[PDB]
Amino acid sequence: WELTILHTNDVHSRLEQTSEDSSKCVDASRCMGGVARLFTKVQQIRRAEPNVLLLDAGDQYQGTIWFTVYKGAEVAHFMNALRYDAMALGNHEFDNGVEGLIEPLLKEAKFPILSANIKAKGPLASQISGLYLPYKVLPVGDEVVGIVGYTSKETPFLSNPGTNLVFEDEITALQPEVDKLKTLNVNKIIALGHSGFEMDKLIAQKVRGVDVVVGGHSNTFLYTGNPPSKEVPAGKYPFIVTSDDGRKVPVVQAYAFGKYLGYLKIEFDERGNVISSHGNPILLDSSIPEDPSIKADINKWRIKLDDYSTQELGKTIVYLDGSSQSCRFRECNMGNLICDAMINNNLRHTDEMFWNHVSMCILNGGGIRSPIDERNDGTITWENLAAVLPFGGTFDLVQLKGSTLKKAFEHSVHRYGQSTGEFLQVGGIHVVYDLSRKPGDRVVKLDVLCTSCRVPSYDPLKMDEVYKVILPNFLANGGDGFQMIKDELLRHDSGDQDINVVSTYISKMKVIYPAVEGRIKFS
Amino acid sequence: WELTILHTNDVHSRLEQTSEDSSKCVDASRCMGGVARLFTKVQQIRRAEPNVLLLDAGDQYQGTIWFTVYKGAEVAHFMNALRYDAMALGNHEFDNGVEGLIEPLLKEAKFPILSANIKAKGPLASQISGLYLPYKVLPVGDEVVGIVGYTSKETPFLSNPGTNLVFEDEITALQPEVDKLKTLNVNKIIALGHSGFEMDKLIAQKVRGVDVVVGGHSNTFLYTGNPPSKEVPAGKYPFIVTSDDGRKVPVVQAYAFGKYLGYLKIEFDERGNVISSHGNPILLDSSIPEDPSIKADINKWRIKLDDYSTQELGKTIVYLDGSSQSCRFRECNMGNLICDAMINNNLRHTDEMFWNHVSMCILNGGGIRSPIDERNDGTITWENLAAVLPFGGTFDLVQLKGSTLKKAFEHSVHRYGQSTGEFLQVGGIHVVYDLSRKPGDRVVKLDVLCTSCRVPSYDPLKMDEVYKVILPNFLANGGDGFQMIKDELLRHDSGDQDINVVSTYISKMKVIYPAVEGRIKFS
Ligand SMILES: COC(=O)c1ccc(CO/N=c2\ccn([C@@H]3O[C@H](COP(=O)(O)CP(=O)(O)O)[C@@H](O)[C@H]3O)c(=O)n2C)cc1
Ligand SMILES: COC(=O)c1ccc(CO/N=c2\ccn([C@@H]3O[C@H](COP(=O)(O)CP(=O)(O)O)[C@@H](O)[C@H]3O)c(=O)n2C)cc1
Ligand SMILES: [Ca+2]
Ligand SMILES: [Ca+2]
Ligand SMILES: [Zn+2]
Ligand SMILES: [Zn+2]
Ligand SMILES: [Zn+2]
Ligand SMILES: [Zn+2]
């Protein structure tokens, strides 16, 4: 019996086709992904293969102005149009709190939404009961397939689920659910979830009864053969894990941003044993036409986005200096605003040991692409912010040793004076450079805002201590020569869309007035 | 013909009786003022004198939780109960914008509200037409008295009137209105307004046809004889100004906070010439009973204030360190919060030469009377803020030369180490002390946030430059040994209630997290 699993993960609001690097589409002849093109390929496969499941491993929420305006209604609408068969909750599905997930996604999806390791408490437990499930048994042809969900145990640090949801250890929560499915004579079981490739491999190894793991979160690209685009595979597709009981369990993921459709064929015997599996993600490039009906519906929904983009988000009473002459040479107030917005976006619930789990921000000055003039009655619109932050990136959370962060600050000024992009704007950091010193030895003071403290205050950076830092995905990936960040980071989780972080902060503040205040000094 | 003018000014939300220093009443046998006691005395005078006018020279708005909750409805209600005959607009009547004045005061007052020098433009001119007037001619016995109003030309820097109101020069706007009243055979004219004793004397000298000036704003106490309480008179009551045409024009004011009722008797001849005048403010002490009906109505209205005081205003995720061990010895985050709230409260409309007219704050650490613990789910209520700021003061605006501010910072640490109250918490200032230097020479660096700049940044303080600074009225009056502030300031205007400034900022921010960030350092 052959099952074809089609899968997406970390689509992150890429409803429209994008450029090759998943940013705004500008060259139509080379644009990729989008739900209209995904519809064409899914429909084509479903004409040819008898037993198909279209699955999403979470993180449809967050990434573009589509999510900013429609807040999940676009996810329910377009996933329903694609006839997704099941979805696991991702961390970003909690960005607008549990109410922003219940309404509109859980109440409007025409498919089961799953997570076996999220447990609600208090009144929320009654309010949400049955709106997401630990698993669902689906009929596929003449057989049944059980799908069990899971979500990152670190979601409380990576989104806004609130205090009435408990994120349990994935393997601990999954095993009894898979044991239960086996008692109900379900012999084909998929674990679909959102914890990252490392946890997916552990689930494949340790959760007895799981036949395949379909994951996400880590934006992992897996491929068997010559890659079709610029993504470099972390391993073959599927990635085979040998389980504790000796089975070969395929693990799949399909990068992010709707650029690929994962495609895995699994051959099962009559008792649900996996005989073999093969496949590969399919690059959704211009060779696959956008479905005209889905595209026309996208164009209709885009009208409200165009309208929203010109509305006042809030006001500034100061000139927002995002010039290169300032932001690539010294502390600039646009850089301070963006880092303050990044820290505000990452305020999450804590135990009694931290005021917040993260207090620090770095931002390459070359990533700030325009100032904003305050003389248009102080108005700031999304279109103005998109000129400042045009790359479609995210502001991610990383864990870096103090030694790595000191090397990043040395890199920031290693060839100072040429208007290069690596000069860092900061938040929760006070750095002093002495440019008369040799490159690599120019940082003379580096103080950081504490997190494990009830009163935030600055203390010297410690080389062996690991710090959480919010920074662009461009820098987490080693852009601008920050190879030390890519190579030495101890954890990396994708964050919110860059424009959206700043827009939300400006709308919350109503009137902004960021100052240049001595976060960066020169001796 | 004898006219008795009863007058109040700068009542500032003191609806309830207060202590002798106009703070919370705690010893009933020695409490003063309040509208119930004012009613008793006004009613007594109106039984005995035939020609009485009860006037208010503005600034009923702002000062206690009454204004925070009722937003002017309490002013219309209790001024109507007292049967005020006329009121001039004060600067604080614009604290909640022009909408917060129209609704509820202008639409609910049963007396004319006056200002001849405020001119509206755009649609507002039609919306507000006739809701305030330049003047009103009132019948008094068998005669008529014209009352012409005026409001501080500096109101745009001292409240929130918005950009559709123009504040003209008082004398320029008053003269044509008084000329018009004279053409209508009105021969007895009172100028009632809110610009301060200095401007009141100029109006008495220069506006031809004005028989008496009833003022406010500067909280001036005038008295003829031995003063009845702790207020020291600035001059006799009335203060006589010789007009340009040789008339003797009485100028009156009655301190502030409803502690006194001004009482002036003017003898006019049949042609409206002033023959003589005499009087004195009456101390509203415990010897005058509170009117039981007004007091019972006050007690009824107080219920909603008690309810409001326990509601969550917003949350803190940090411990708000208002301890004396911190705030009298070093930068404390409660001090930073209060100074940031003071600067936010003073954001006003500007031309293109300033991002804001004021950027600096000083606050005596001894004025911070409690920390706030963040472990009650981060909740902050008005009752918690009242424990931090219990004195019932205001956060005022002063103009100080840099030399005066340097002397204030030397005073801040002149006897450092004894937990004395004068140690300053700051905003928009970065100071460095070297305590090994002799007292009076301990300030080694003092940088200030610019105002005449499009991007706020810090520069060294200049001894000859005048800076606007927000600070407690306690310090503006020379408290804590800051005699240099009292003696050398170039302008002083009373600001908003201390608790209200902080409450509004916390409610706007929703979640606060003030840090100790290096505003005060030690070498
Ligand atoms: C609609 O979207 C685009 O046009 C789009 C274009 C690219 C990507 C991918 O590359 N992402 C980048 C690329 C560069 N930079 C910054 O730009 C600096 C270079 O800028 P300049 O010295 O001014 C040279 P230029 O005028 O040709 O741009 C780098 O040093 C670096 O600091 C980034 O921050 N990011 C995130 C994504 C989208
Ligand atoms: C319900 O209201 C009152 O209890 C009320 C009491 C008074 C006033 C008038 O006085 N106003 C003040 C008085 C003092 N202080 C500060 O307190 C310091 C002295 O405090 P300690 O060293 O702690 C001595 P203590 O325990 O007896 O208070 C001063 O150095 C000064 O920094 C002020 O800030 N203000 C504004 C008003 C109201
Ligand atoms: Ca099986
Ligand atoms: Ca006259
Ligand atoms: Zn993701
Ligand atoms: Zn994720
Ligand atoms: Zn006043
Ligand atoms: Zn005033």
Curated annotation (Swiss-Prot), chains A, B:
CDD domains linked: MPP_CD73_N
Lipidation positions, renumbered (GPI-anchor amidated serine): S523
Glycosylation sites recorded in the entry for this protein: D27, D285, D307, D377
EC number(s) stated in the UniProt entry for this protein: 3.1.3.35, 3.1.3.5, 3.1.3.89, 3.1.3.91
Record entry for activity regulation: Inhibited by adenosine 5'-(alpha,beta-methylene)-diphosphate (AMPCP).
InterPro entries listed in its UniProt record: 5'-Nucleotdase_C, 5'-Nucleotdase_C_sf, 5'-Nucleotdase_CS, 5_nucleotidase/apyrase, Calcineurin-like_PHP_ApaH, Metallo-depent_PP-like
Binding positions (Zn(2+) 2): D10, D59, N91, H194, H217
Biological processes annotated in GO: adenosine biosynthetic process; ADP catabolic process; AMP catabolic process; ATP metabolic process; calcium ion homeostasis; DNA metabolic process; inhibition of non-skeletal tissue mineralization; leukocyte cell-cell adhesion
Topology of this chain in the membrane: Lipid-anchor; GPI-anchor
Pfam families: 5_nucleotid_C (PF02872), Metallophos (PF00149)
Cystine bridges: C25-C31, C327-C332, C339-C361, C450-C453
Site (Transition state stabilizer): H92, D95
Positions with a binding annotation for Zn(2+) 1: D10, H12, D59
Major subcellular site: membrane
Family of the protein in this entry: Belongs to the 5'-nucleotidase family.
Protein name, per record: 5'-nucleotidase
Highest classification ranks of the organism: Eukaryota, Metazoa, Chordata, Craniata, Vertebrata
